[PDB]
């Protein structure tokens, strides 16, 4: 059982916005064990009127973060994705997911008295298709691990999509799609 | 057997010439089956006078569409590729090839009564090298499903490669070939 | 045993300057095999002074050269990488790695009296953080096959990342790090 993720088509599972206390956005993300690397695939959905408006500025960030347990499962508290990940294919009461985290071999975390990470990141492009068809770059950043947002964590993935355009996108609500994004990372141990 | 293919270096195989009814290209398309994703694995490369003169204009746009049944095969009087793709390890006697296609939960079709799903587009980069050694980007676009041809279709998947450059990247005819793109998609089931 | 890689967190392993005889940086390289496919990944680290104020300058080229073996070993007299891949899980002495290696079929060499093979580049970038947390790109190629070095090798795998920026990322020496860049390629047959 090679696949852990969202689902393939998920109902509203993550938060975007402030404060806000129920979810607002679908996030897809899979993450398929090939050998030493994790295969990452995510997109965003929005599902409220507040996302669903964010592209009618021209500066946008979008911010998804996930904090893992030690045996890789969604500590919801804390993290924009309020249901954890789950197998493709179901295994025995509490399985551990701990082959599909990212390395702290390879993305340590900046501990008080060790140097700090820059090795933690991956960086790429996807993209906003807007309502009159028009094509926008999002700049997405992954970060592994390197920086703890509490003591009760012990693997952290986060997402961030960013637009700084000349015009905003849109002038009225529509839908926000973030089109897939590919990413591959080192995995712990099983 | 994990891989579904035109095999590795194919003689022309495709027509991209509007109106053409013979091949006049190279289509080399590599899916791999690896959990609940496919890694996609594209290029194209040009094999008629045609072809290989598109890029001594600056504005530049390449379609290339693929059309599958129910079983996963190409339907070649529509499509682009007019051999079906095979497994790179023989199977039994039309072996379905379904579980490489793109979902049609992830990736639905507009149909009539149902709102338009711009959730079905993957969208990249790769690069053209002329023959003075200038690298020219091209805009890929991939499609998956979102849009049926005709009434006979299960599946579709198309690429478009596109520039629109300041100056032509060549002046006299020249190998086209696009440099390979990689994609990942969600499958569906076997 | 489907991964070939010099290890997760490697020590300085690979010579980037210019006639320099011990290693000067950390190059991470990781091949697993995808069906028909390799999956690639790869970063660099500096560890000289020299390497690590080369973004000093606006300009940067970097270059690693691996030149392997008709059984997919590192020719480390010629290569940039100094210690050969490894096998994430131990084989039998000198098991073949020509599973790994680049197709010669799809990426054939530039023999004296065949045509050149420019189908034998991938293009794409990754990025440079650099110490105020500006983000730079770097254009990356990889070459596959096409140019001998010598009559002693079989397979060729050439990275080049590249900066031509307008102004130099860094004033004073910081750690140069590549953010991973993912590539695919089709391999040769067990």
Known sequence: ?????????????????????????????????????????????????????????????????????????????????????????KQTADFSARGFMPSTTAYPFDLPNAGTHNENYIFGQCYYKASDGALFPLEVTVMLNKRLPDSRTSYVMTFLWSLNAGLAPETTQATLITSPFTFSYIREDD
């Open 1 to 89: 059982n090679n696949t852990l993720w969202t689902g393939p088509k998920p109902e509203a599972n993550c938060i975007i916005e402030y404060g806000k206390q129920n979810p607002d956005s679908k996030l897809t993300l899979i993450l398929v064990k090939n050998g030493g690397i994790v295969n990452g695939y995510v997109t965003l959905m929005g599902a409220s009127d507040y996302v669903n408006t964010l592209f009618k500025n021209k500066n946008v960030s979008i911010n998804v973060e996930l904090y893992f347990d030690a045996t890789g499962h969604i500590l919801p508290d804390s993290s924009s994705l309020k249901t954890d990940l789950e197998l493709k294919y």
